[PDB]
């Protein structure tokens, strides 16, 4: 049995800018059980159906997971733009796979704010699909070099979400899992 529980029920999730990727292989995957396994608020598959996923085999399955704002979940889809799609986690236009999300306010918000979850707010250019950027150099927003010194036009590139339990639903944390289905010239190991 594929260790989906390890991904979906992990105690901590990654920050979106440092999104985690888990490789799943050599196992049987029941995606109908996965679909019905909890109340997910988002469960959208692109080019595939979870019922038809049960009759397919893949070389590897990849599960990307992270936390974002509720208002940002729509950016975890092919063809989207915004601070998450552009600078944190980018799906390809031709994405095949599934996107699953659920409200995680009970786990990831703190009274006073959970500042452990971050996203990249400043970046010179957009991310390529499935690119990950974990640099934290002070970001030069003007003509004057920063030399590692924060100040006017010189910004730490990551921002904390600061999730609080009293946030409105759209600003509460949502845990997200993206499933990608890989086909290599190699024996199938996930069926």
């Amino acid at each position, epitope marked *: 049995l594929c260790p989906f529980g390890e991904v979906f029920n992990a105690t901590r999730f990654a920050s979106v800018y440092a999104w985690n990727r888990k490789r799943i292989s050599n196992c049987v995957a029941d995606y109908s059980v996965l679909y019905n396994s909890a109340s997910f608020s988002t469960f959208k598959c692109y080019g595939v159906s979870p019922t038809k996923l049960n009759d397919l085999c893949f070389t590897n399955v990849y599960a990307d997971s992270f936390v974002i704002r509720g*208002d940002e979940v729509r950016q975890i889809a092919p063809g989207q*733009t*915004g*601070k998450i799609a*552009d*600078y944190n986690y980018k799906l390809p236009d031709d994405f095949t796979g599934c996107v699953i999300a659920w409200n995680s306010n009970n786990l990831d918000s703190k009274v006073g704010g959970n500042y452990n979850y971050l996203y990249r*707010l*400043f*970046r*010179k*250019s*957009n991310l390529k699909p499935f690119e990950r950027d974990i640099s934290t150099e002070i*970001y*030069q*927003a*003007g*003509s*004057t070099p920063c030399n590692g010194v924060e100040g*006017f*036009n010189c910004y730490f590139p990551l*921002q904390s979400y*600061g999730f609080q339990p009293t*946030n*409105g*639903v*759209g*600003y509460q944390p949502y845990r997200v899992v993206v499933l990608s289905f890989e086909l290599l010239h190699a024996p199938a190991t996930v069926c």
Partner: single-chain antibody
Amino acid sequence: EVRLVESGGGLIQPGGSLRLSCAASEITVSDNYMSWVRQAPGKGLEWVSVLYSGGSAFYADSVKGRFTISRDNSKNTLYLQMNSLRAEDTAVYYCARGDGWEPPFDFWGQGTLVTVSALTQPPSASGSPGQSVRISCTGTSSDVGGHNFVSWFQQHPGKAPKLMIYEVSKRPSGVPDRFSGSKSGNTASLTVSGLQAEDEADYYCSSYAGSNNLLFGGGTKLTVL
């Protein structure tokens, strides 16, 4: 010097077209959130468009499909192409750095006039010199009451708005600490204490409202009596 300098403008008939320019100094347009904000004569502020450092563009519902934001990195200049103009596009158009909530509109151009032929604030408020006044800004749980992306602006006649408070209670460098921002439930408040004649001005609140909607209050005129 840090500058944002608009050009272009004038009088157009409905269905006409105009392109505005915003030439920056020190601020690097291609590396920043850059926006246009407009103000119809005698009225409040309305966010128009933002251009992201990576090239993504977003637009207010009122202009989507008619306006286009763009830039020339070699000229360090931001542009607003405005097509299919209507009478209701009449406004002073400001460029500004920021997206209006994260990061806030901290730096503003001078404005340029184009003529084509919600958050609840009290219309007015007053206080006495050295005393205090509280300006309220009432939203809903999906904006003011749902997050901390609330800003406050001061605007004097003939000048661009000036960022006074961001993130509910944070003051930009140089803003006097007798300007204080807070929030209770769905209502944000700007408290101005130690009131001085120069505090006479219009004050606007702003809040992100989700789905790339940026809201401004209708403005409060502050009289110091």
